[PDB]
Amino acid sequence: ASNFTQFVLVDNGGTGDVTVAPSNFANGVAEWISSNSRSQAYKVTCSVRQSSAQNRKYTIKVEVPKVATQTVGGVELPVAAWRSYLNMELTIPIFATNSDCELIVKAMQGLLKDGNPIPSAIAANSGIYANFTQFVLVDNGGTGDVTVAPSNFANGVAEWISSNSRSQAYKVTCSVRQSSAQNRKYTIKVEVPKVATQTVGGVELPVAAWRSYLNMELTIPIFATNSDCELIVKAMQGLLKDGNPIPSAIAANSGIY
Amino acid sequence: ASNFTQFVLVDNGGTGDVTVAPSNFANGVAEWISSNSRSQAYKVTCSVRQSSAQNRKYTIKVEVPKVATQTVGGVELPVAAWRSYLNMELTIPIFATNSDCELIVKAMQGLLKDGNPIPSAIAANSGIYANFTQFVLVDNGGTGDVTVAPSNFANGVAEWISSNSRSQAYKVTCSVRQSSAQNRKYTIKVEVPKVATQTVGGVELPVAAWRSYLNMELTIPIFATNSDCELIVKAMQGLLKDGNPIPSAIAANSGIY
Amino acid sequence: ASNFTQFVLVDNGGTGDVTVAPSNFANGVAEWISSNSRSQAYKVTCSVRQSSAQNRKYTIKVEVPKVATQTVGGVELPVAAWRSYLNMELTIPIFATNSDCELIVKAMQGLLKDGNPIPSAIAANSGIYANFTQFVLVDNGGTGDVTVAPSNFANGVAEWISSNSRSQAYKVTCSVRQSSAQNRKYTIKVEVPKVATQTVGGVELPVAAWRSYLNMELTIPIFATNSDCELIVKAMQGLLKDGNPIPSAIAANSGIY
């Protein structure tokens, strides 16, 4: 309920906090503003939309403006010269118990943790970026964890499904390419499956609702570098961080308000 | 660091050692020469090239010239009548711990060991050659080993993924065919996955960077026989042998210099 | 009194010299040849040409041979088994004063000397040398540095960018590619910018007024052993250091004065 609390997007350390005021957006989505004007601040969207018939989506965008003086006037107009668009339509179950979403929430914070894969990849912007990595999607805590390795490499578009079948494990996809004369994209689809209401496979399973389709389109301009890209990552993880309104909504099978 | 040490390519036994002096090649690659002229010696390349966005490659070639008097002059011109081209663009992770590459290094020496599959196959040149075999890719030592059997046989182009999912195990491919009036090829792709920073699946996994695409194109001329082909194999294994500069580079996520 | 004459270039210890005498210029294309035998001579070019109305392009190719012996038909024919192709196209605008070119030359030749992170690739395994990271290059006295970090490789084309601003960054490329069945070609371009200020529209936009284009294509056959490339690199970079008869033209009035 009303998880609209002013949470810090980028946990830099206290200085220059990208603190974002909640409560906003029109026709079905969410928002979280930072302390500046309508051209240099950070955008943080999050909408709930019943994708199909048994699987509801979660469109969640997050902008990462480059805080630099505009080069089109020579005045003090605060605006970004380029932005790091972060899209992610995370599908999800609904009639399953509350602990099912916790499994998917950790499946988002664990995807971006301090000293982990993607977070330290897209952060250097080059000797590592774009996408395909590994991480225990569900960080349960010593027992019940989900391991997930890789295999195929067709046309440079990978697809990884966990320690189960090619039709019953935590799958994730992606791809990068120079779409035009200036930008690039990170189509990191993270189809997060659900496996809750269970101890360790103790029959009391009766789970419900099938999958999620976390399709992502992270456009990163060629004007970025190492430093500005670590900020892009901190925007992705500071998005789905425990206790924050973005993942907490996705935790109770609920929006925000 | 500077793994450029004179290592013996073919471990024949001391006589006629194909010892190769290191330190060479232009515009991004490596070399290791043998004691002769520029037409009968053995070539041993190895380049590092960031294939995509999160997966860096390892183009590694190795020539196997037939030490026979040239049949185009009747003089003492030392040159090969035919060569056994060995190509292998081995992709790989980078921001993962040093022990991740050890897993992939053994995944190359174990692929060619004394009294094993491929090494005793391509060696007889006929009742066994070309490709598709098995071997514990990662030779850990009694615990944590990776078993990997087979299944499909579509159009004669096999694909084998290990004891996991069709999207999360050690996969490898290949194929052979008479490309022209005189040569043949061994398109032995060995897509080596990574699974490090872990005991035996003890949660402390947090691994990173996805897969490798060790595409291979081993062209073997129809003028070869049993004896000259064992030398071709010893060139493949003496390439990725522990302690040698080729796999040692691939062991520390590094080149040579 | 005659300029463009027999000069000195690539050398090692005391045995064979490489005096490059003059030869042709037909239709605006300089050319230098060495000793008695042309089939073993060191070809080099140079031509002035204004590309449009605000620029001045150039073309300085270089073919480095090999003192081998092709015996075909019972005759020992002294011919090169391969040749280099160091072709540096450089565009210099009219607006760019006579104080930019001096620092451009030491940035093109002063980019690949005898092991720099870019040309060490042209002399050893790590054709990146460093798992491809932030390296050093062109410098002068103690004021501004040029740390060249990584950036892109899409479709097999390495690329390095420097500091904060891309419009003032030092781009550089590198890609492995086997041209046919008996050769190995490469491509290492280089764009050297200028820390100028284009004020158009009242804004001081930090952008380069021009960029260099040191593109060295090098073909190395499979027959050529791992002892030719070492002496090829010191012949391409070891051709234009910081005033050699060929690159002194790239730093002063002297074409070959």
Give me B129's structure tokens: 């050659």
CB contact under 8 A, B41 and C123: no
- Indicate which technique resolved this structure: X-ray
DSSP line for C67-132: ---EE-SS-EE---S----EEE-----SSS-TTTTHHHHHHHGGGSSSS-TTTSTTTSS-SSSSSS
Dist CA B56 CA C150 (whole Å):
13
The pair phi, psi for residue A186, each rounded to 5°, is -125, 85
Q: In sequence order, what are the beta bridge partners of C46?
A: C30
CB B28 within 8 A of CB C122: yes
* Chain A contact probe: residue of B51, B54, B173 with most A CBs at under 10 A: B54
Continuous segment of H or E residues that includes residue B8: strand B7-8
Dist CA A126 CA B54 (whole Å):
8
The whole-angstrom distance between C153's CA and the closest CA on chain B is: 6
Dist CA C106 CA C84 (whole Å):
21
The Cα angle at residue A10 between residues A5 and A16, in degrees rounded to 5? 95
Give me B170's structure tokens: 């050690």
Closest by Cβ to C154, choosing from A124, A127, A178: A178
Give me C167's structure tokens: 């419009």
CB B190 within 8 A of CB B220: no
CB atoms within 10 A of CB C210: 22
CB A135 within 8 A of CB A121: no
The dihedral over CA atoms of A221, A223, A229, A234, expressed in degrees to the nearest 10, equals: -60
Residue A146's closest chain B neighbor by CA? B203
Continuous segment of H or E residues that includes residue A68: strand A67-69
State CA C236 to chain mean position distance. Answer: 7
CB contact under 8 A, B52 and C229: no
- A207's CB contacts (< 8 A; 6+ apart) are A96, A100, A194, A195, A196, A197, A198
The domains of chain C are located at 1-257
Closest by Cβ to C166, choosing from A70, A74, A222: A222
CB B79 within 8 A of CB B97: no
Q: Which resolution, in Å, applies to this structure?
A: 3.5
CB atoms within 10 A of CB B76: 9
For chain C, the chains sharing at least 3 beta-carbon pairs closer than 8 angstroms are A, B
CB B229 within 8 A of CB B122: yes
Q: Is A206 exposed, middle or buried (0-12, 13-18, 19+ CB in 10 A)?
A: exposed
CB B191 within 8 A of CB B173: yes
Closest by Cβ to A127, choosing from C133, C201, C203: C133
The size of chain B, in residues, is: 257
- C78's CB contacts (< 8 A; 6+ apart) are C37, C39, C40, C67, C68, C69
Continuous segment of H or E residues that includes residue A237: helix A226-237
- Which of C188-204 are b and which e, b meaning 16 or more Cβ less than 10 Å from the residue's Cβ? bbbbbbbebeeeeeebe
Dist CA C124 CA C133 (whole Å):
16
